[PDB]
Design a binder for this molecule. Structure first.
Ligand SMILES: OC[C@H]1O[C@@H](O[C@H]2[C@H](O)[C@@H](O)[C@H](O)O[C@@H]2CO)[C@H](O)[C@@H](O)[C@H]1O
Ligand SMILES: OC[C@H]1O[C@@H](O[C@H]2[C@H](O)[C@@H](O)[C@H](O)O[C@@H]2CO)[C@H](O)[C@@H](O)[C@H]1O
Lengths: 134, 134
């Protein structure tokens, strides 16, 4: 439908992005991409219910000039098909901090050294209900 | 240095789009555009404080394949520079309904006969802080 795509965000370091959406009742995977543009992502947030060999695994990665970086996987999966889920992402020069629905937080390195986030895109089995920018 | 631009909005008839943003302190006016894309707007929402010869007047218009239609001016002006303002928009095949910060709501004809709104863009005087779909 695909997913909501926002540009010109100009999200600066220290600012938080709140994204709330509905996880499809038959969700297999959904994505929230953040970065400079579609080919340069400081954060590819990919909760995989069942995809690419991952079962209930949050996979994160960066994308530099179209090239996927080294994947990072989390130890929790507070997402359930057919339920609303909210994620809070804070941008910082060194790392991005992600706060999951249940309060679990983890960081992902700002490998691309972005000084601001101007691009956000949603895709997969996640229907965005609201997005808050600072 | 324009404002936030969102695409693939997929807003359907009856769904309520709530947009909250900060009006620049030195804003002479601000704009929130809704439509299919930058050249096809079902709604050019333009509150003018002091711009284009108008004072404290909300000017609305449509843009079809690039052509601006006949403007319609609203009866109220519940806006102020340097403050947070939220507007709620919904639509059907005939009209768009815009609800203002003061609870006042008016209709603007759906001249593009849109059955879905996929594009939204704010200018440099309206910093979007949150967008909700309900
Ligand atoms: O890295 C994010 C990226 O992963 C792709 O899938 C990977 C898979 O995660 C990995 O374990 C395997 O070895 O290679 C696959 C191909 O690169 C996803 O397909 C892509 O959409 C992103 O999610
Ligand atoms: O119609 C939307 C369009 O208006 C342009 O300005 C008009 C102004 O609204 C009208 O009252 C005056 O007579 O002529 C101006 C120029 O044709 C804005 O410049 C444009 O950005 C839109 O807001």
């Amino acid at each position: 439908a695909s997913g909501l795509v926002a540009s010109n965000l100009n999200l600066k370091p220290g600012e938080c992005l709140r994204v709330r959406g509905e996880v499809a009742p038959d969700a297999k995977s959904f994505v929230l991409n953040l970065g400079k543009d579609s080919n340069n992502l400081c954060l590819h947030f990919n909760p995989r219910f069942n995809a690419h060999g991952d079962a209930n695994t949050i996979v994160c990665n960066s994308k530099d000039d179209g090239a996927w970086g080294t994947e990072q996987r989390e130890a929790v999966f507070p997402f359930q098909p057919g339920s609303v889920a909210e994620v809070c992402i804070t941008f910082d020069q060194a790392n991005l901090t992600v706060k999951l629905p249940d309060g679990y937080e983890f960081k992902f390195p700002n490998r691309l050294n972005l000084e601001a986030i101007n691009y956000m895109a949603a895709d997969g089995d996640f229907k965005i209900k609201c997005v808050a920018f600072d």
